[PDB]
Amino acid sequence: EVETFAFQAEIAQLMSLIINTFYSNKEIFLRELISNSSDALDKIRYESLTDPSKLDSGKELHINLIPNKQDRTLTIVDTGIGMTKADLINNLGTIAASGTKAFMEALQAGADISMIGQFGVGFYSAYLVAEKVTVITKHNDDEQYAWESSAGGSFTVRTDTGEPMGRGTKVILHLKEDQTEYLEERRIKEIVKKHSQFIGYPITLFVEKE
Numbered sequence: 001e002v003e004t005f006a007f008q009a010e011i012a013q014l015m016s017l018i019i020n021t022f023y024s025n026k027e028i029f030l031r032e033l034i035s036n037s038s039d040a041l042d043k044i045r046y047e048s049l050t051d052p053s054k055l056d057s058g059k060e061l062h063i064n065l066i067p068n069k070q071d072r073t074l075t076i077v078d079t080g081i082g083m084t085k086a087d088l089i090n091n092l093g094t095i096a097a098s099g100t101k102a103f104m105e106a107l108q109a110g111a112d113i114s115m116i117g118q119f120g121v122g123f124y125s126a127y128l129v130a131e132k133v134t135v136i137t138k139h140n141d142d143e144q145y146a147w148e149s150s151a152g153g154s155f156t157v158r159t160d161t162g163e164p165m166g167r168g169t170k171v172i173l174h175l176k177e178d179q180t181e182y183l184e185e186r187r188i189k190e191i192v193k194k195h196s197q198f199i200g201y202p203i204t205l206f207v208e209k210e
């Protein structure tokens, strides 16, 4: 079963704004997705202080950045708390209706697209660079799921029975044809050093075969 859902009007609005607005500083998508991974890793860290068994699905708390030039994908993987099916359907755990409203109001009062993360909807900045985003997630409380959307108003959710992840979330960006600089090692290193240099978990940038 693949289930197909409509984005709530606010999110469809937000996604169309991200896709259509001329805005050159697209590189902030990676800061926003690393930020979301850090917040998910903080959540499982906190739960484990009182219940160490929550780490039976993997003790290591880390983020991996995986470029793949053959597939035109950049994947951000973390071993944070992951999301349940209900969280995926509910705007990937975000308060995206109210966040979208506050972000629009801020843009009127002089903010710019790079401030999106302040409003709790930074995930959607993926659409600055990707034509399609796939999110694979596993929470201790639930099965592994894949969410997917190429925007256009709808997203799908389906049980994933690809390679099991112990716990956490993988964001797979299928990059736009003109945004392949974000698969280049030196470009990813530069962005991590510029915007994510104090994140409190290891960030490993994977190498590709020649």
Ligand SMILES: [Cl-]
Residues within 6 Å of the ligand: 094, 095, 096, 097, 098, 099
């Ligand atoms: Cl909300």
Ligand SMILES: [Mg+2]
Residues within 6 Å of the ligand: none
């Ligand atoms: Mg925060």
